[PDB]
Design a protein around this motif. Structure first.
Motif: not given
Length: 474
Positions: A153-165, A193-207
DNA sequence: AAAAAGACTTAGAAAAATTT
DNA sequence: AAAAATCAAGTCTTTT
């Protein structure tokens, strides 16, 4: 629709970073350096990994080094210019210490923290969906750290930032009490949205992909899907013969497209290869599936080790795990495979003029809900049942009949190429085999299900442990 | 069409939970 | 008692 009512407490945020002791120092080119809190933090991520293979890979080090600088003060960027000159050992030892000072905690200490967890779990570990309380899987946000991409993986070692509210999108019914963010913060959004199964979501920075917090396997929403999944594979049991005959004749289509897909459907069916979707060129590790196979991944041999018409596969599947195998194929297929290799370079696609969209599109026309993956489940499930009926000695004993199960169970893990670190039986046992199959067998042979499935497995497969009897046949 | 975006399954590794 | 054994990466569906 997926639910009528939904209420929950929201995500649990990562602990804030705790600064290093004054006694624990960082050295650069022999000199000490009080790193800024943000540069100190990143450095620690690296330090806690100095005992890991990751820190020896040059991709990790470069990714890490670059991203670390993006955090330093203008002054650290002037000084810290060589990773080879950074000394993270003192720092490395402190955490190592901490770990031991944890392995070596008093019972009172341990007990105290066990209960600190129990309160977190009992508070944010559940939600109310419709009229019942369900268990939430990943209720805590992934902590900031260095990316651990598997393989090259060409992105290994990249920083995964802290997720804010402020990155968090909350999902709950319109009539529900919205989970309040930490004091002085706001959610990114709140949807109903009652067409989905998730309770929470956030965008991950690396991908740049969306991460979700979803329910537990034992949840209704999850179990229902699982049940459905096996049903779909049971329906395939009925028309596979039609399906195998049809592509078997497509091997002689006067159209290569039709042949490329029939040989692909062939492998998927016989070998249990994954669909093989395309991966972004130079942004993921180089792994391949059936469709994406390249010319360099197979070697044909008119006769090999006595065998005739042998296709030799050698590639890295999902997680960069290696799939190696020599398969004696049917002449027509072997030949088609040669037809597909002509005038191509090693880096070329075997099945050019063909993709997963095309393949599955086709599958769906043949049976509603049929997809590449359905073959794997089906093949696995049909395999285990056949073996449980073939290896299970009638007058054997629970333990030996349990070994019987294990042998039948392992025949499958081999089909899927499941490897722990080799032959891992967990995934098939949890993901590809119709639970009703084992439930039946257990009931039939008087082997207690507790002997095969553990409490969680029983929580998950509960639907099966109740609705399947000694007359169950996938 | 084909990419991007989105939602959820699948996977191995790492963390946490019988014998001397 | 103490110590030794036993939480990314696909697939498939939707949306320039």
């Amino acid at each position: 629709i997926k639910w009528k009512f939904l209420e929950h407490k929201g995500p649990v945020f990562a602990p804030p970073y705790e600064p290093l002791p004054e006694n624990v120092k960082f050295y650069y080119d022999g000199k000490v350096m009080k790193l800024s809190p943000k540069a100190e933090e990143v450095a620690t991520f690296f330090a806690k990994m100095l005992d890991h293979e990751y820190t020896t890979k040059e991709i990790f080090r470069k990714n890490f080094f670059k991203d670390w600088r993006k955090e330093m003060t203008n002054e650290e960027k002037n000084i810290i210019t060589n990773l080879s000159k950074c000394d993270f050992t003192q720092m490395s030892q402190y955490f190592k210490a901490q770990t031991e000072a944890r392995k070596q905690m008093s019972k009172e200490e341990k007990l105290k923290i066990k209960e600190e967890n129990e309160k977190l779990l009992k508070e944010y570990g559940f939600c109310i969906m419709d009229n019942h309380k369900e268990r939430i899987a990943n209720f805590k946000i992934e902590p900031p750290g260095l990316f651990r991409g598997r393989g090259n993986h060409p992105k290994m070692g990249m920083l995964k930032r802290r997720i804010m509210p402020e990155d968090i999108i909350i999902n709950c019914s319109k009539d529900a009490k919205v989970p309040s963010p930490p004091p002085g913060h706001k959610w990114k959004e709140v949807r109903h949205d009652n067409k989905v199964t998730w309770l929470v979501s956030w965008t991950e920075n690396i991908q740049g992909s969306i991460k979700y917090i979803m329910l537990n396997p034992s949840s209704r929403i999850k179990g229902e899907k699982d049940w459905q999944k096996y049903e779909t594979a049971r329906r395939l049991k009925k028309c596979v013969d039609k399906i195998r005959n049809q592509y078997r004749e497509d091997w002689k289509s006067k159209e290569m497209k039709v042949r490329q897909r029939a040989v692909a459907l062939y492998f998927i069916d016989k070998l249990a290869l994954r669909a093989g979707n395309e991966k972004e060129e130079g942004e993921t590790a180089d792994t391949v599936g059936c469709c994406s196979l390249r010319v360099e991944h197979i070697n044909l041999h008119p006769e090999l080790d006595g065998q005739e018409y042998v296709v030799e596969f050698d590639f890295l599947g999902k997680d960069s795990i290696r799939y190696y195998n020599k398969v004696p194929v049917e002449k027509r297929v072997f030949k088609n495979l040669q037809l597909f290799m002509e005038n191509k370079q090693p880096e070329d696609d075997l099945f050019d003029r063909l993709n997963t969209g095309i393949l599955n599109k086709h599958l769906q026309d043949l049976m509603e809900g049929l997809t590449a993956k359905v073959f794997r489940t089906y093949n696995a499930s049909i395999t285990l049942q056949q073996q449980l009926k073939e290896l299970t000695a009638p007058d054997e004993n629970i333990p030996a009949k349990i070994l019987s199960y294990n042998r039948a169970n392992r025949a499958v893990a081999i089909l899927c190429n499941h490897q722990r670190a080799q032959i891992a039986l967990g995934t098939s046992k949890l993901n590809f085999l119709d639970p009703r199959i084992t439930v039946a067998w257990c009931k039939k042979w008087g082997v207690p299900i507790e002997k095969i499935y553990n409490k969680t497995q029983r929580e998950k497969f509960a639907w099966a442990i109740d609705m399947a009897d000694e007359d169950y046949e996938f």
